[PDB]
């Protein structure tokens, strides 16, 4: 079952503010992870910003979540050995219309 491989680690916008479903990025730091720092988005409101600049509760801000690969230190504090892990992260927010029909 364990499939160990070699990995060479030496590798060769203002939307969050202008969006109708704006969001804030929060720093997530983990010394036992690669990348150590991941920026996760949190929606600013439940509604969406309307043309007059106010929150419209007839539409909703929802997070856009993607699965990403990360390297987790195995054993803990190991600088050269990791386990591949898949985590879910929020990238930003989109504005959705609720279903009002059959």
């Amino acid at each position: 079952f364990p499939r160990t491989v070699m990995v060479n680690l030496n590798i060769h916008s203002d939307y969050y503010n202008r969006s109708t479903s704006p969001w804030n990025l929060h720093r997530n730091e983990d010394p036992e992870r690669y990348p150590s720092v991941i920026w996760e988005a949190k929606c600013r409101h439940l509604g969406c910003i309307n043309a007059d600049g106010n929150v419209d509760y007839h539409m909703n801000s929802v997070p856009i979540q993607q699965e990403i690969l990360v390297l987790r230190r195995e054993p803990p504090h190991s600088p050269n050995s990791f386990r591949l892990e898949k985590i879910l992260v929020s990238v930003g927010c989109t504005c959705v219309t609720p279903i009002v029909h059959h």
Epitope: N24, E40, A41, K42, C43, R44, H45, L46, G47, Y57, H58, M59, N60, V62, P63, Q65, S90, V96, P98, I99
Partner: antibody
């Protein structure tokens, strides 16, 4: 994985006191408002109390106002419910519930994305 | 203060049936309506948030719809594991209230 673990529920005589505790893990506890929701045996869900992320504001169900106190210790990642002057209406399973993590904790009107296992409080002589 | 009424209070349906539960609020909650599934002897689990959004891991057969005062949770093809009590909840105004619940049983 978010985990909420409750304890403290037990038999308490009418007019007595009990303190419920909820240990949180898997998220930044100090970033979110926390709540207690109860369910009387064979009945529906009923919101009991809410406390803001840094304990500065508390909100209660009318029937428990003055009798219950919601508190938190962000350093110990735990939520508390001090229950005094216990009555028959207070016999219920008490759950601690937390909001979704992909929304700002400053949004008061968030739903309960995560719940503890529940702790049973029985008010009886 | 905002009262939520679910209909029906209980129902029985065969595996494969389309099941519909309604939730009516006495005043508008706009889109701050959510649904929970509670299995016997277990804590409630969030199914739908903000009228129509399923949380990750919730099967495709569950969908929510509605507006203002009338909301609906639909299970498109009932499965044996869907035996549970479903509750609607409004977070529009204090105090946050829940519907009385709808018990869903399987006909076999």
């Amino acid at each position: 994985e978010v985990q909420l673990v409750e304890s403290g529920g037990g038999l308490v005589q009418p007019g007595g006191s009990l303190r419920l505790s909820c240990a949180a893990s898997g998220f930044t506890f100090s970033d979110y408002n926390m709540a207690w929701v109860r369910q009387a045996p064979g009945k529906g869900l009923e919101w009991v109390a809410t406390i803001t992320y840094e304990g500065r504001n508390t909100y209660y169900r009318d029937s428990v106002k003055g009798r219950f106190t919601i508190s938190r210790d962000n350093a110990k990642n735990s939520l508390y419910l001090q229950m005094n002057s216990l009555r028959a209406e207070d016999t219920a399973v008490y759950y601690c519930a937390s909001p979704p993590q992909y929304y700002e904790g400053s949004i008061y009107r968030l739903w309960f994305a995560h719940w503890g296992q529940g702790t049973l409080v029985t008010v009886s002589s | 203060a905002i009262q939520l009424t679910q209909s029906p209070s209980s129902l029985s349906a065969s595996v494969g049936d389309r099941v519909t539960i309604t939730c009516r609020a006495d005043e508008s909650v706009r889109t701050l309506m959510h649904w929970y599934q509670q299995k016997p002897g277990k804590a409630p689990k969030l199914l739908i948030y903000l009228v129509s959004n399923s949380e990750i891991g919730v099967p495709d057969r569950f969908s929510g719809s509605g507006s203002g005062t009338d909301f609906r949770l639909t299970i498109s093809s009932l499965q044996p594991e869907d035996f549970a009590t479903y509750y609607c909840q409004q977070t529009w105004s204090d105090p946050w209230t829940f519907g009385q619940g709808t018990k869903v049983e399987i006909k076999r």
